[PDB]
Amino acid sequence: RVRHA
Amino acid sequence: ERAGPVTWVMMIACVVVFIAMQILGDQEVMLWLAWPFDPTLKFEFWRYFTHALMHFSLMHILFNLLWWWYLGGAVEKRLGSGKLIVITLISALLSGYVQQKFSGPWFGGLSGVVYALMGYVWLRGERDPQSGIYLQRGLIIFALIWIVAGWFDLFGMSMANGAHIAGLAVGLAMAFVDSL
């Protein structure tokens, strides 16, 4: 999963 | 009293990008706006910053923009537009650089800048009350919970660890520097 900033 | 131009334009930009994500898919928007993921993209200068404009769910965007609206709002009102632009650019750029170094270029969101803003508003108030800005006690707590939820991955989602730590560091560093 894409990392959430 | 209302959000100045920089606070506003960042909010609209994030919404427009979020809309485009819903119509185009997240992957098509990431192809355009993500940190360079191929050596051929290295001169597309916007990509070092625009990773900040991408959010992957309703809760992701709401939480990011709520903090931005409050903290960005406070900076812009007390210290002016220019200062918010510079804090945002530096935190977006550095947070991005640390995140890709940790985990590659697939990431996005405004939380690098938010963690900077939290660090900055807090430490500037502490070191320099004459500035006219500070983090109110209650928000110190909720900000502190936010940071703890980052360190310990309590949000229930894949986390940009490098963006968070670099973002917080930059806000503290910029506050230190401005408080002289």
Author numbering:
A (entry chain B): 2 to 6
B (entry chain A): 91 to 270
What does the published report state?
Rhomboids are serine proteases with a Ser-His catalytic dyad (Wang et al., 2006), and they recognize their transmembrane substrates in a two-tier process. It is assumed that first a portion of the transmembrane domain of the substrate docks into an intramembrane interaction site of rhomboid within the plane of the lipid bilayer, upon which a linear segment of the substrate (possibly generated by local unfolding of the top of the substrate's transmembrane helix) interacts with the water-exposed active site (reviewed in Strisovsky, 2016a, Strisovsky, 2013).
The complexes were formed by soaking the inhibitors into apoenzyme crystals, and the structures were solved using diffraction data to 2.16 and 1.78 Å resolution, respectively, allowing detailed comparison of their binding modes. In both cases, the pentapeptide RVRHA binds the active site cavity as an extended β strand, virtually identically to the binding mode of Ac-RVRHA-cmk. We do observe weak electron density for the side chain of Arg in the P5 position, but its conformation in the final crystallographic models of the complexes of 9 and 10 differs, indicating some degree of flexibility, and it is probably influenced by crystal contacts. In addition, the P5 residue does not contribute significantly to the inhibition potency of 9 and is thus dispensable. In both inhibitors, the ketoamide warhead is covalently bonded via its proximal carbon to the side-chain oxygen of the catalytic S201, and it engages in a network of six hydrogen bonds in the active site. The tail substituents of 9 and 10 (RT9 and RT10) interact with the prime side of GlpG, buried in a cavity delimited by the side chains of amino acids F245, M247, and M249 from the L5 loop, W236 from TMD5, F153 and W157 from TMD2, and residues V204, M208, Y205, H254, H150, and N154. The NH group of the side chain of W236 seems to form a weak H-π bond with the phenyl ring of the tail of both compounds, and F245 engages in π…π stacking against the dimethylbenzyl in RT10.
